Amino acid sequence: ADSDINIKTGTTDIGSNTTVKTGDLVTYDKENGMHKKVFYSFIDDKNHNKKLLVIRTKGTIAGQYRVYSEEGANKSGLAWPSAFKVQLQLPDNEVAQISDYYPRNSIDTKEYMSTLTYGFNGNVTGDDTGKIGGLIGANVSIGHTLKYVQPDFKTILESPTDKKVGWKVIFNNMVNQNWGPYDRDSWNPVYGNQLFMKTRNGSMKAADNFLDPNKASSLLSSGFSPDFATVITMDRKASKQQTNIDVIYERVRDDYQLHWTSTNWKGTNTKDKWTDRSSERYKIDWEKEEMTN
Amino acid sequence: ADSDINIKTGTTDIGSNTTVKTGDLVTYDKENGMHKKVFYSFIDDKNHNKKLLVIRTKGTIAGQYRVYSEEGANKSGLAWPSAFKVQLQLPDNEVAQISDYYPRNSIDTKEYMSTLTYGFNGNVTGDDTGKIGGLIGANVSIGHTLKYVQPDFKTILESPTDKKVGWKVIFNNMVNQNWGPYDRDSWNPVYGNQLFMKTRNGSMKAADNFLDPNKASSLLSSGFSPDFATVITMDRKASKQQTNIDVIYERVRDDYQLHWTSTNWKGTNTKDKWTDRSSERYKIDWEKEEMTN
Amino acid sequence: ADSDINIKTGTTDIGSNTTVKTGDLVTYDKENGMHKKVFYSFIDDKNHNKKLLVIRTKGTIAGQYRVYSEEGANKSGLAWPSAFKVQLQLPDNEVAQISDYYPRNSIDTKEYMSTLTYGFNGNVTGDDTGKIGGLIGANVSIGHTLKYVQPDFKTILESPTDKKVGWKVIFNNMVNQNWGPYDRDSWNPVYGNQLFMKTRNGSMKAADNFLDPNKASSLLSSGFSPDFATVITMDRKASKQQTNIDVIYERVRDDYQLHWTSTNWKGTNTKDKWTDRSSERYKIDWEKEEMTN
Amino acid sequence: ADSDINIKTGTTDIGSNTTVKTGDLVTYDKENGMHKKVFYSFIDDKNHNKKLLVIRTKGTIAGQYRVYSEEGANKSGLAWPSAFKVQLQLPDNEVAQISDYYPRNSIDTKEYMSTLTYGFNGNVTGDDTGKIGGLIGANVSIGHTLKYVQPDFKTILESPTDKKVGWKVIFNNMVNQNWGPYDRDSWNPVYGNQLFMKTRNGSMKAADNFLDPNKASSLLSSGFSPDFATVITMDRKASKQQTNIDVIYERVRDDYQLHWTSTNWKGTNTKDKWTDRSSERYKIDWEKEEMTN
Amino acid sequence: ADSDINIKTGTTDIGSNTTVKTGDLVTYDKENGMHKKVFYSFIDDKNHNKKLLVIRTKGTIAGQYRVYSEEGANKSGLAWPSAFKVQLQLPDNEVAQISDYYPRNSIDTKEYMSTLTYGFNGNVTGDDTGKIGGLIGANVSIGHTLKYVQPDFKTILESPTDKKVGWKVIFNNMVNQNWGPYDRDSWNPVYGNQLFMKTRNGSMKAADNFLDPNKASSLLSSGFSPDFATVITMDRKASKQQTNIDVIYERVRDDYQLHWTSTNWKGTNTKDKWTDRSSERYKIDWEKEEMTN
Amino acid sequence: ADSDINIKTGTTDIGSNTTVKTGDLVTYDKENGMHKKVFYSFIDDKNHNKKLLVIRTKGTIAGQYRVYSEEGANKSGLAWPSAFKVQLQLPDNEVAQISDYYPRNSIDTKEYMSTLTYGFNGNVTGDDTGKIGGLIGANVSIGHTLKYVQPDFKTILESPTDKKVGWKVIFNNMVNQNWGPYDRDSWNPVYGNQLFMKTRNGSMKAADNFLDPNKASSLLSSGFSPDFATVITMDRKASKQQTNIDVIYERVRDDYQLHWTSTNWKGTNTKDKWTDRSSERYKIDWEKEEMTN
């Protein structure tokens, strides 16, 4: 908070009384199904120390959630997006540097609750024959309650070096038709990994027995559209005013197969089965304030 | 957040010191009952890289929730809107591109709660005859609680390519007269799919035994009015400054029929029975900054 | 959100650097008790495509909650407002069109909660005579909880065509003196529809045995005052610059009667008994920017 | 609150009608994996008393969560980041002083709840043979409930002297696969410290039996990126207008080892095993308003 | 609220169209470990009645939480900060006066909940031999629940006279390792004051058996940094335009000692054992608008 | 809400394009310990109808919570602030009038919850000897829950006439060491009024057995600082332009005494024992726009 140090709010920010030349570059990768897009903005504040360039890799990455193989009614497979990644890199010989990046790791909290209860009890029982009975009792109880919120997909900022910074979205866990949350490492001795399972002991075809993509999370089938911001700073006295960047939009898929053993369906998951990578190289012209490729 | 990178807020946005020529086109499709409307805005910022055009397909799509067929008092049908869709497309030979789209897939969270309880107990019982008894006991308890929020209709952004982007609203589930949430795949061995069922064993006519549209969700009967935004960017050095777009407003209906078997009503649902499509082609004039059709 | 597409906020809105000529027309319908009022605003933005006119039918519609008929102490009636409606229409031969309307159908959500509990138990019992007993036990529990919020009156936007758009407010359900929520279709074999019932087996007069209007909802007795906005767009090259509109303020009442059968009061409801309609025709002068009637 | 003393809001803040010369210095420490960065801003308000300089050590510190040693399948180790630290210091002979620092210790609250319950009971039991029995009972209950929120990592502001100020982020506690929160001092007679333990009695290799970094907190593996602000004030009549600062980015790691004793895994933690320090010295030029190194 | 009296918001505030000369004075007390700082602002509004000066004693006071004495393994002591205080005073012969002070005593609320439950019960029991039994029962329950939030440290504004105003932060209560909240007056016949106790019957050294400062509150070890505002008003026609102020930063520590009696540790607390005071005198020059010392 | 009548927000407020001459008067009453202060503001808007003057009696009133009398170890007294009051009055012959006053009585709400539960039960019991038993049962439950929030002190606006307006803060109730809320009229046959009681049957001195002022509410010991606003309007054509006001800061104390009867302490409260009043008269000069005394 700028106002908590008694400084007038917005005083220390950069971008005042200057013209920024924005831009946009859109490209679609038919082979990998990644509608990648970057939104740049050249800021050169005289009161600042270095030339600035903020790059927002908005884009969109498809989900690719479908049944790839079926072998009769006995067994079938499924490929689902385990993780989405997008990273920017600079050549080792380059002079520009990575300064900031908005989406960053944040500390997560949890509730906690301790309970203690004392009790007392006493009743008098009687019947027709005149018998009279008594009872005196007491009890204690101690309880611990802990609650927290866990998303389906968890965004992470991989350790950013000076030249490359990258983000990552992984599959935390999912709830299958109101059943408890399942994850890639979940296992059951009878049924196995019941993550994308429709019915435990249905009589349908193996390929038919899979969770409806509408029922599952949206990111599995319709994909994940990132919104990540990074700023590159270049010294204004550098000999060479041209820079190259690489943008990658890799996606990792897993193999989920269920098998009809004797009576019930048994599901098995094989993590990190395929990876689809789409890298494109852009060129920066600091003198002309335009990035084109 | 722009202010989290120490950049002054609003610096990187586009639209400063320029005039935008907005517009409006309204058309009603009597056959399909779709009051479609698009709201465009031509933005040409000199500091930007490409000409811009944001299109907001506000419109409105009717619900069409009514009983289509009745066969005596034994059985009757019902057509209800399973899903609403609206998509924009560009010709394959076009030079413009789709850049951004506001409503996008978002990660959904869930609560979780673990409980543990220890107990102790002890009572002393006595009667008139001098008998004295005792009792010492203990207990343990482990509990898992998981809660989440689920809407009636779920909006989804279908994987947007470079030329076409489309949204989709599907029927997640509904609560029937305070009874548990039902969906298209819900089944009961006795009653069947009780989604749009008034009384389980009523003596009324089959056509009369259907849930009141007022009781059900508003989108089923009065329809769904979208609000979706997309921006098309065209290079300012292109030879041809005219572009064509197609806007579709398709709606998918399902067939819900209940049948009087012997004593109780039995309901059956047939998903994706009908689809109504309304496509209109617009023309863009970048040089004159007007879209007309 | 305009700022989520990287466009500067408020850029695409219409109404900048222009003068809007507002207005007001107030009329009271003594026969129907409807204090109707419309608030118009003529916006002609040069950068826009069509002339604009936003109409806000604020007004007010009375409730008319009273006992209409009494027949001795054995039976009596009651008329209460089941639904309030207000709709605007344009002639079929007109050239103007309906573009937008603020209050629109919205998707409604619901909570859901699944619980699972394991238990264990064990006690040792002894008495004076040296008898020693034991007990070991366990238990399981599964629970489903679903909660949602339901208003007394539910506003709905009837499917708007190109020429007419109308809203609707209906009676969802009401709580009678802390008793469970009742609605028009509620039925009890003994008492019947206990919606507006004071005492189940009171000895008072039939007309006296009705729920106090203060206890019931405010809209039943003091009426409902709408606030609905609609915008009409007219091409600026049209030959005729005069337009006519019709505004209707219809209200629907139901007949609730309770009858003393032998020991207890029995209540019956007859939906859609009366309708009061108040239609007024206004004239629009686009050239002079004034609506008068 | 400035407005609560009847002073106009923002009147007492500093930074009005002046130009601030910001800056940026980025450096990466390959040996320690610390992407350190500082963002300075020189404010010289004529109406103020001293020259100002606010330093924001944004940077980023990696996590370094990995298995360092394995000795067969019997035992293996693990190094995880116990605490992250970042501190600024001034030479003892310097004339500048540390004035303010935004992130500061805050008081933490807790809920509390007291419950009291009275009860009464009575039943009548009878059988075929005409025996009639009775029972009258009562009970009391007293309960205390206390709940609070505890984060995984806790940021602390070490006692700031005139010359040096430093912050600190420590490992409060973590939840292991829905099991109760564990910390460095947690101990179990059978299993030991089960903090980073996958399975209690798994048959896998010792190195394989460790909690997945994705399952654990993000700061453990992907590191912690600070955002801390400090302002240095220098008298404007000082003879020497040059100042030196030191910035340290130390990180402390702990040694977690699990051992297979006879049947189950036993985990042991050794706090404060390694510390990685990265100190860099900057030079301040108040006359030229630039910090360079 | 200014707008609730129909006055335009901000009209009655002071500070419009004037220049305020702020300032800063920083001093560190090595002996007492108090980094004291004051931030003044001279406001002389012509439309106001008196010259103004708002003083913000931001500063910082250390915690000083450490074991001062140990006597073998049998007993040891501990000094912890019981309360932090900061107060401003004016000479009795002075002409200036204290007008306002932002942090002030506020009324605290509490929840309350009353519950009432009626019950009924009935079961039929039978066995093989044809015996039939019955049971009819009922119960009542009354419950009172009261919940409130209590912080660890409680800030208080001591009764401000015309010449001196002072604040105070005291130790309300603390939770020790999830155990119930303890305070200075808490007592247990067996263990005593278990406030800063690690293990009830540990075998470690007495000095070692103390709560980790990280586990305890942050203010105990890293200290408390105040933020308090006060405004001094001086008549503009006074003969003498120079004023003196005194600022005190006293801190009170308590003595917590645990003793190994025979089997378990016993803890005793001695409140108000030491007080550290740091008073500095400043001089105000109203004519020159500067406070220096 | 100004914007809900379609009027532009802030249009109807008063204070536009005018200069307000504020002021401040501070006085301390050593005898009664009341640091009273008033903050006036003269507003004369030409577009308004009357001259305005808003008076804010900020001030501060001490608590005066102390033991006044002790008689050995058998009994002792206590004086605590039961209520704080502050009121303004005008002479009966004056021409000015009281117009508005911000803190005003507000309606308070409460939650309510009705619960209904149905149950069913059935178990089968068997033993070694072949005996088989059964049991079928059911139960019902009805519950009413009502919760609300109640502060320790309750501010009230006494009925304001044309010449005088006054506020009042009373002692609603307090929680004594986690025990149920007690008030002045609370009574117990054994212990009596246990409001400010330390221990029920402690062996300490009577004067020592009183609740610590830190444990009790802050307003009891450190006092209550009001913030109340009132505006006085005077006709601009009046013959006499001078007005007199009276400001009172009365405080009411109660006598709480506990007595050692035979085994336990018994507490008694005597409401409205003392009242301390501090009235000061101010003079208003409308022509010169200054209030001085």
Ligand SMILES: C[N+](C)(C)CCOP(=O)(O)O
């Ligand atoms: C896991 N489960 C499907 C057996 C029960 C579902 O309840 P929960 O475990 O999600 O609380």
Ligand SMILES: C[N+](C)(C)CCOP(=O)(O)O
């Ligand atoms: C599903 N049901 C109608 C039997 C019970 C309703 O309760 P719930 O299942 O919605 O919690």
Ligand SMILES: C[N+](C)(C)CCOP(=O)(O)O
């Ligand atoms: C419906 N009722 C009047 C029998 C009980 C009221 O409780 P609820 O049904 O509103 O929870």
Ligand SMILES: C[N+](C)(C)CCOP(=O)(O)O
């Ligand atoms: C600690 N535990 C793993 C035995 C139980 C988990 O429940 P909780 O202790 O987190 O409430």
Ligand SMILES: C[N+](C)(C)CCOP(=O)(O)O
């Ligand atoms: C006080 N205690 C440690 C015995 C129990 C903890 O529970 P609580 O008293 O904080 O609710």
Ligand SMILES: C[N+](C)(C)CCOP(=O)(O)O
């Ligand atoms: C009143 N009491 C001290 C006996 C019990 C405290 O619980 P509560 O009455 O505040 O809920």
